[PDB]
Amino acid sequence: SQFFIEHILQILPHRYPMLLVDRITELQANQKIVAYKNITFNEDVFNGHFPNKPIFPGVLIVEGMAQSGGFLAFTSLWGFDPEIAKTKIVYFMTIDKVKFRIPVTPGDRLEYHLEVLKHKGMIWQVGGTAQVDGKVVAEAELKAMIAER
Amino acid sequence: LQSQFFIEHILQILPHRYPMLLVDRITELQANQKIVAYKNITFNEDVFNGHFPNKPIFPGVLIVEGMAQSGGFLAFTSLWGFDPEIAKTKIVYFMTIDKVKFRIPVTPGDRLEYHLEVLKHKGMIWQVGGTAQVDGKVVAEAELKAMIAERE
Amino acid sequence: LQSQFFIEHILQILPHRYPMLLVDRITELQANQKIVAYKNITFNEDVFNGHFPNKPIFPGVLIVEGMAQSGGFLAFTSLWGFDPEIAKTKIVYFMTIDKVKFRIPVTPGDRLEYHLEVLKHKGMIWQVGGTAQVDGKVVAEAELKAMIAER
Amino acid sequence: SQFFIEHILQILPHRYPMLLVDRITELQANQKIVAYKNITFNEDVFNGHFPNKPIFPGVLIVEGMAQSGGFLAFTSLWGFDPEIAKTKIVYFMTIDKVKFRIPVTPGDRLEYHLEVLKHKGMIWQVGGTAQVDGKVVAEAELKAMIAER
Amino acid sequence: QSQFFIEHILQILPHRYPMLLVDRITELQANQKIVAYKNITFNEDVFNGHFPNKPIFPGVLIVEGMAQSGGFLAFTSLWGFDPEIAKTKIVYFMTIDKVKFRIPVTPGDRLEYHLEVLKHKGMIWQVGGTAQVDGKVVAEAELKAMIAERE
Amino acid sequence: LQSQFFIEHILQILPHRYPMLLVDRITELQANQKIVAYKNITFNEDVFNGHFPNKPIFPGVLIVEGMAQSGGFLAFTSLWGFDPEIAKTKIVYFMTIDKVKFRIPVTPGDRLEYHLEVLKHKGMIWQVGGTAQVDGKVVAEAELKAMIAERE
Ligand SMILES: CC(C)(C)c1ccc(C(=O)N/N=C/c2cc(Br)c(O)c(Br)c2O)cc1
Ligand SMILES: CC(C)(C)c1ccc(C(=O)N/N=C/c2cc(Br)c(O)c(Br)c2O)cc1
Ligand SMILES: [Cl-]
Ligand SMILES: [Cl-]
Ligand SMILES: [Cl-]
Ligand SMILES: [Cl-]
Ligand SMILES: [Cl-]
Ligand SMILES: [Cl-]
């Protein structure tokens, strides 16, 4: 269930500054994942969002949830397989029911909670929340398709 | 009351700065009704170092972000017009995002055009929806409700 | 050989990478004769943090760089066609620049179009010249000579 | 005693990408300070330290400890006074007895524990450790000087 | 009056990171010539893309560094070290001519700009000179600029 | 075997990369003994955006990092000679740092010269010591122990 940055880098194609998942704490095939990304002032994004008021972009919180969800889907089908990971692309088709409740700032441990709402073939629907210190800071539902890279 | 604004005017209204100011120019603006704007996409952008190596694709979420900033400009200017002084005291926040669909990937060389329409507005609360287009084709769709709050 | 290439093709031919690959797409290519290409200008470019604060202006020298990169792409595809393997066994370097004029400032939102024609070419030495345009208006002119070399 | 990034910004002169303290959890004038910095893969430093193997630079761990000490120094001297702070900068004078025991990586919450060893005027000597999940990842002593910009 | 460091340069030139390419002024004779330089280090972003595994300071940036040196010369010739007046002026570079690159510039080099006033007629300044590394000429260039009121 | 190495040679030995490769050239090298190298300091470096705004000062800790990297180059070449294929899978870990003292601020325009001497080495563990200099003056002094290791 625990995957670190090294493991993550072998499954996801994302690299700096768009790999928004630092560690995976829980993974239940075909069911759910709990992962997180540490938020620190030392991130380029804060230079512009916003000057004198660092706030992690809501859309990037969603991106982080999507990446966690994609990791879940890929792993549920193929497990930890770097080889096969390079032959697949997990792109997102839709995003819906997104709600932002609390602003995420430097010092926050942005935890992603996604579960498989539904899946058929290579189409997977995940949903859940983003949490900081046990509180729900955002929620969203996403639908992704898995295909040959 | 103007319909065209360039980056210098955008900078005076939106608080966003590099690397999160995703609107380069506004070509159409109709108070309380709609806005048409765009962001040029070029390889010379840091995001492409990671999305993805050897396969530059503009992140769908940033397409949405650009749509929101456009809506936000529309919301503000609809209420106060081009007023930099007051703009510095307000900030627009994403409350919700719905019905997002990504149809075509956006890549360097593309002119990402935002088309937002006002679906409903009451005071500081604005609901907009629209599409992101490239050479006339819809590459993305989205609806979102924003909030015009105090910067402090 | 084709007449249009996208960023994916340009990455396979030019050795330039971020933040110095200043050509996004190729629209017209006529071997040993001319090329029309362009680079989109956006505020979301690091260059603008320093050129200048509160007033984004695409550096004139980078417009020339862009023209040079277009020239280099023409030069190489003229001699080897679309060949990624041979391409990576090369680099191109500026030898001279002349008659450059900066008529109109280039800013975010602009589609910087490069128009180059081969003035002269002999082996790895190419002499190109032309203009940089925005919405059909000349914003800059320049002549440059470059060379493709081994590694 | 609970300071956030915007408070830290008003005291320390450091800015991106050299501001390495995200939050202050404990503060006791002329005694000690406990703070932390989140470590995420989304930090430019990791592009070069090292490729395919992200390790937060040991020297930056020390820098983060120094900044923590600096904040303790500024406040111990003038309390939380953004106006006086804005005129100053901080200079490293000495560094000694530093030992790194465990590598810090993306996903880690790097906590700084510094106490005052000695001080006089603008010159402050502090020492302590850097910890992750309650375990000491580094030790250090350092002397710094606050000066007029 | 002769030696200006980075603090001073920052107060006269509007350029900022990543486009301020002059680190220190070592010699300045009002209305005559300027000698200044920029250190080249591998720890510069441009090297990420110019070129991977082969760091080479872009030729166009050498010309930019020369342009900046000329601008500081022109400005200081007219008003001396005056940060306040500096904030209200701009120097548009109109043309670049006869540039030639003889030796590549790389990390570890101390790129020295040697500019001299070729002509000054009104708001127009024509400067020229060379860029040198360890006493050897690595580049040559002529440039014409216009002094104007900021806005 | 050689005594002078340029940035291309440094890239083939040290694992560090942008923005953490802080050695531009090697001017002297005596196996298992000493090394003299330097890094040019320029305003055009990202660290200066934050250390400090309007007052560029090369971070003291990065000076130490530069000395360590100098020692590392010395350590590796003393072990396997100039062997890029072997160096390709090694990394360097800081173990300790002692008696570091900063005497003069390093600023843009400075040629930061590292002078390291081997105080003791055994296997992968090198205990190196020396100074950093600008125009013949001691700008800093430090003692450090680093360990060369294989990427696992
Ligand atoms: C949802 C839609 C239609 C806009 C879409 C479709 C495809 C893609 C896509 O191609 N994503 N990733 C593609 C990709 C990534 C890497 Br890495 C790669 O080596 C290759 Br070939 C890819 O096609 C993204 C969005
Ligand atoms: C942002 C602001 C107002 C400082 C600004 C705006 C435009 C420009 C510009 O288009 N060109 N040049 C500015 C400039 C000023 C001096 Br004094 C100088 O030595 C050089 Br060379 C310049 O390029 C420069 C600065
Ligand atoms: Cl947001
Ligand atoms: Cl995407
Ligand atoms: Cl320019
Ligand atoms: Cl380390
Ligand atoms: Cl060049
Ligand atoms: Cl320091």
Side-chain angles (χ1 to χ4, degrees):
Chain A
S1 279
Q2 266 238 289
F3 291 86
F4 302 76
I5 192 59
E6 57 207 288
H7 307 292
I8 297 173
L9 284 165
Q10 288 175 272
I11 299 305
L12 300 180
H14 308 59
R15 288 298 183 276
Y16 180 95
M18 278 299 292
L19 172 48
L20 319 179
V21 182
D22 295 318
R23 195 176 293 174
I24 298 176
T25 53
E26 294 179 59
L27 195 315
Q28 282 183 47
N30 278 42
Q31 283 290 138
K32 77 186 189 75
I33 187 181
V34 176
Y36 72 96
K37 177 205 181 313
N38 278 335
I39 309 302
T40 181
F41 184 79
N42 200 212
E43 299 182 57
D44 199 19
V45 61
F46 292 124
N47 281 303
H49 199 285
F50 301 90
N52 310 141
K53 198 208 295 290
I55 298 175
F56 196 66
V59 302
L60 292 191
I61 295 180
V62 180
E63 178 55 29
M65 293 181 74
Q67 297 181 190
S68 296
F71 190 95
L72 171 58
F74 178 85
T75 299
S76 291
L77 300 161
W78 297 290
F80 185 66
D81 189 314
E83 283 205 78
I84 294 168
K86 295 170 185 170
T87 68
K88 313 291 175 170
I89 65 173
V90 172
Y91 74 72
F92 282 79
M93 306 177 86
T94 75
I95 297 179
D96 198 35
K97 265 60 186 185
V98 175
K99 293 171 54 52
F100 300 111
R101 303 180 181 287
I102 302 169
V104 176
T105 73
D108 289 348
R109 179 192 195 282
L110 186 63
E111 209 181 26
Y112 307 117
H113 296 256
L114 283 302
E115 58 172 330
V116 179
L117 308 176
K118 188 170 305 173
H119 73 91
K120 184 187 176 185
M122 296 298 104
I123 304 187
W124 290 58
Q125 295 190 48
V126 302
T129 61
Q131 295 168 34
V132 184
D133 300 313
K135 291 186 177 56
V136 166
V137 300
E139 37 181 284
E141 282 185 21
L142 314 91
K143 170 184 283 172
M145 185 195 291
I146 303 176
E148 278 294 312
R149 189 174 296 188
Chain B
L1 61 66
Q2 225 79 72
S3 288
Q4 256 188 295
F5 303 89
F6 304 73
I7 191 58
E8 48 254 57
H9 310 295
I10 290 171
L11 290 166
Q12 292 181 272
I13 299 300
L14 301 179
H16 307 68
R17 288 296 181 280
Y18 179 95
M20 284 297 300
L21 175 52
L22 311 179
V23 184
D24 299 319
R25 196 174 295 179
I26 297 171
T27 57
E28 288 183 38
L29 189 305
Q30 179 53 50
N32 308 296
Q33 271 177 265
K34 74 148 174 172
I35 181 169
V36 176
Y38 70 93
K39 181 206 182 304
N40 275 333
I41 307 306
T42 180
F43 186 77
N44 201 209
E45 295 185 62
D46 197 31
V47 287
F48 293 115
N49 281 304
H51 196 283
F52 300 88
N54 296 311
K55 230 293 175 175
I57 294 175
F58 196 66
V61 296
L62 296 189
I63 292 181
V64 176
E65 178 57 25
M67 286 171 78
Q69 296 178 190
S70 290
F73 183 102
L74 176 61
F76 184 87
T77 54
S78 282
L79 290 162
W80 290 280
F82 193 74
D83 190 325
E85 310 165 350
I86 292 189
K88 297 175 185 170
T89 68
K90 297 292 198 173
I91 202 301
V92 178
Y93 285 137
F94 254 128
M95 281 173 88
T96 63
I97 300 181
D98 294 286
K99 314 184 192 111
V100 176
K101 178 62 205 307
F102 299 119
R103 298 178 180 292
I104 303 180
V106 174
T107 70
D110 285 353
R111 178 182 188 279
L112 189 58
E113 185 182 70
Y114 310 114
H115 290 240
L116 285 300
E117 322 245 54
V118 180
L119 301 176
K120 168 186 165 60
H121 75 93
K122 192 200 161 305
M124 305 298 108
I125 307 302
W126 294 63
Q127 288 176 47
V128 304
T131 61
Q133 299 172 33
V134 175
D135 183 37
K137 292 70 183 168
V138 174
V139 303
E141 331 177 323
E143 309 203 332
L144 58 112
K145 180 173 63 164
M147 165 181 101
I148 301 181
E150 290 289 81
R151 222 112 139 187
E152 285 220 293
Chain C
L1 218 210
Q2 310 161 191
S3 63
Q4 189 178 201
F5 309 72
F6 301 77
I7 194 59
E8 51 200 355
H9 303 106
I10 297 167
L11 284 175
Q12 282 174 273
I13 301 301
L14 292 183
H16 311 66
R17 288 297 182 267
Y18 179 102
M20 284 299 284
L21 171 50
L22 310 178
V23 191
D24 295 321
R25 192 172 299 179
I26 313 301
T27 55
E28 281 185 53
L29 187 74
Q30 225 194 301
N32 310 107
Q33 293 188 73
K34 50 168 286 183
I35 192 173
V36 179
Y38 74 95
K39 180 204 181 308
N40 270 345
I41 308 303
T42 180
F43 182 80
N44 200 221
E45 300 188 66
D46 194 35
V47 204
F48 292 122
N49 280 301
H51 200 278
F52 301 86
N54 320 306
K55 189 81 172 167
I57 307 176
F58 195 67
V61 302
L62 292 184
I63 293 165
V64 177
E65 180 57 26
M67 291 178 85
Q69 283 174 30
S70 292
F73 186 96
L74 172 59
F76 184 92
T77 53
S78 286
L79 260 36
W80 287 286
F82 187 66
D83 197 317
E85 290 317 283
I86 289 297
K88 54 188 179 200
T89 74
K90 311 286 189 170
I91 283 195
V92 42
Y93 59 83
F94 262 107
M95 289 180 70
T96 68
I97 306 186
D98 229 294
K99 313 192 176 316
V100 28
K101 297 189 164 52
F102 296 119
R103 296 173 187 293
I104 309 174
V106 179
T107 67
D110 283 352
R111 181 181 174 285
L112 190 62
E113 193 171 66
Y114 306 118
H115 295 257
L116 284 304
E117 78 180 323
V118 178
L119 293 180
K120 172 173 179 303
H121 77 90
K122 186 138 59 70
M124 302 300 104
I125 302 170
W126 293 62
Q127 180 136 49
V128 299
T131 61
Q133 298 170 39
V134 171
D135 188 19
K137 296 175 64 180
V138 176
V139 306
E141 306 165 7
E143 268 184 49
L144 61 94
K145 183 173 70 184
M147 181 182 244
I148 304 178
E150 284 281 351
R151 287 149 138 281
Chain D
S1 187
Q2 241 296 14
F3 307 82
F4 295 76
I5 192 57
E6 65 274 14
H7 298 126
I8 290 172
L9 252 13
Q10 298 170 66
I11 301 298
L12 298 190
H14 312 71
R15 291 290 184 283
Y16 183 90
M18 277 301 283
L19 171 51
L20 320 180
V21 183
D22 297 319
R23 202 171 291 176
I24 308 293
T25 54
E26 274 176 274
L27 184 72
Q28 287 170 43
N30 303 135
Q31 293 178 129
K32 68 175 180 184
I33 183 181
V34 177
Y36 74 91
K37 177 200 180 303
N38 277 340
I39 304 305
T40 183
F41 184 74
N42 199 47
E43 303 184 55
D44 200 23
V45 57
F46 289 117
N47 280 313
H49 198 282
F50 300 88
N52 277 63
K53 175 78 175 191
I55 304 290
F56 195 65
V59 293
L60 295 186
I61 290 180
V62 176
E63 177 71 24
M65 291 175 74
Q67 289 173 192
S68 288
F71 186 96
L72 174 52
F74 279 88
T75 62
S76 297
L77 251 41
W78 308 298
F80 190 78
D81 192 313
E83 202 194 356
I84 295 186
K86 72 177 177 179
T87 60
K88 280 67 169 185
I89 50 170
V90 184
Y91 287 111
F92 242 109
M93 288 192 75
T94 66
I95 298 176
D96 199 22
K97 301 168 185 182
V98 17
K99 319 177 190 57
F100 307 97
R101 302 180 182 302
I102 309 163
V104 178
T105 67
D108 283 352
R109 180 178 180 288
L110 184 61
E111 191 181 62
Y112 308 115
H113 291 261
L114 293 89
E115 88 186 312
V116 175
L117 302 181
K118 176 182 182 305
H119 70 98
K120 190 178 188 308
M122 302 298 99
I123 305 165
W124 286 67
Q125 203 197 193
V126 297
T129 61
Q131 303 171 29
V132 173
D133 189 26
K135 208 160 300 177
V136 174
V137 302
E139 302 170 26
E141 300 200 336
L142 59 91
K143 191 168 67 183
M145 172 168 63
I146 291 165
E148 279 290 297
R149 234 219 177 59
Chain E
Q1 174 60 63
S2 172
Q3 257 225 330
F4 300 93
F5 295 81
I6 193 60
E7 319 78 63
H8 311 98
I9 294 171
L10 279 169
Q11 286 177 268
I12 302 302
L13 296 189
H15 301 68
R16 286 299 181 280
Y17 178 98
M19 283 295 298
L20 173 47
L21 316 174
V22 180
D23 298 318
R24 191 178 296 183
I25 310 296
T26 56
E27 203 184 310
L28 185 151
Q29 290 189 161
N31 300 288
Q32 285 176 291
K33 68 182 184 185
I34 182 175
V35 185
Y37 74 89
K38 179 204 185 305
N39 273 336
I40 308 303
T41 183
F42 179 79
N43 200 44
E44 296 188 61
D45 197 34
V46 285
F47 292 119
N48 279 304
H50 197 279
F51 299 85
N53 302 311
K54 197 51 175 180
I56 292 172
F57 200 65
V60 303
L61 293 187
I62 298 174
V63 171
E64 171 68 22
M66 289 184 77
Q68 281 172 36
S69 296
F72 184 106
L73 174 58
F75 185 86
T76 50
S77 295
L78 276 0
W79 298 283
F81 183 72
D82 203 317
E84 176 174 330
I85 295 177
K87 299 173 174 174
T88 66
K89 307 292 177 178
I90 83 178
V91 333
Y92 298 113
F93 264 97
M94 302 159 75
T95 64
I96 298 180
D97 250 277
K98 299 161 183 161
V99 16
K100 302 158 175 289
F101 300 103
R102 299 174 183 286
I103 303 171
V105 179
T106 72
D109 284 350
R110 179 167 170 287
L111 184 66
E112 197 178 56
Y113 310 105
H114 287 254
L115 283 300
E116 148 190 57
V117 176
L118 289 181
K119 194 185 195 185
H120 171 200
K121 254 43 188 180
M123 304 294 90
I124 307 297
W125 291 72
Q126 204 182 314
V127 302
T130 61
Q132 295 171 32
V133 174
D134 194 28
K136 306 197 299 264
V137 174
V138 307
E140 306 173 0
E142 295 194 355
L143 309 95
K144 183 178 61 180
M146 191 196 281
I147 298 297
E149 187 88 322
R150 195 109 114 213
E151 76 194 320
Chain F
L1 206 168
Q2 273 293 161
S3 55
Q4 230 282 170
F5 302 86
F6 298 79
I7 190 58
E8 312 78 54
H9 312 113
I10 296 172
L11 288 168
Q12 303 182 75
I13 301 304
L14 293 181
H16 305 71
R17 285 296 182 281
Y18 181 95
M20 280 299 279
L21 176 56
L22 309 176
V23 177
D24 295 318
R25 193 173 293 176
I26 312 290
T27 54
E28 286 173 40
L29 190 69
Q30 278 191 161
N32 302 106
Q33 303 151 57
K34 53 141 59 185
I35 185 178
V36 182
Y38 73 92
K39 178 198 184 305
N40 278 345
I41 306 299
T42 177
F43 180 76
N44 200 213
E45 299 189 60
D46 196 29
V47 284
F48 289 122
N49 278 298
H51 192 284
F52 299 98
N54 288 331
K55 189 73 176 182
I57 294 168
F58 196 63
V61 297
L62 290 189
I63 293 180
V64 172
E65 176 66 20
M67 294 171 81
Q69 282 174 44
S70 289
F73 186 94
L74 171 57
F76 182 97
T77 52
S78 291
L79 293 170
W80 300 280
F82 191 79
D83 204 315
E85 291 309 74
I86 295 180
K88 188 192 304 70
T89 58
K90 310 280 178 197
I91 51 174
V92 193
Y93 287 106
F94 239 120
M95 287 177 85
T96 69
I97 306 170
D98 295 271
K99 294 136 196 175
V100 170
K101 175 157 189 175
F102 306 98
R103 324 185 73 113
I104 302 170
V106 174
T107 63
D110 285 355
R111 179 173 176 291
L112 186 66
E113 192 178 73
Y114 310 119
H115 293 252
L116 286 301
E117 276 164 346
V118 179
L119 301 185
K120 169 171 171 48
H121 71 89
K122 183 173 56 199
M124 300 302 105
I125 310 183
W126 294 62
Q127 168 115 62
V128 113
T131 67
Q133 293 173 27
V134 179
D135 183 50
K137 291 180 293 181
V138 168
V139 102
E141 51 190 68
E143 214 165 78
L144 67 96
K145 187 167 59 177
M147 169 178 84
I148 287 186
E150 271 271 339
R151 278 187 167 76
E152 283 184 65

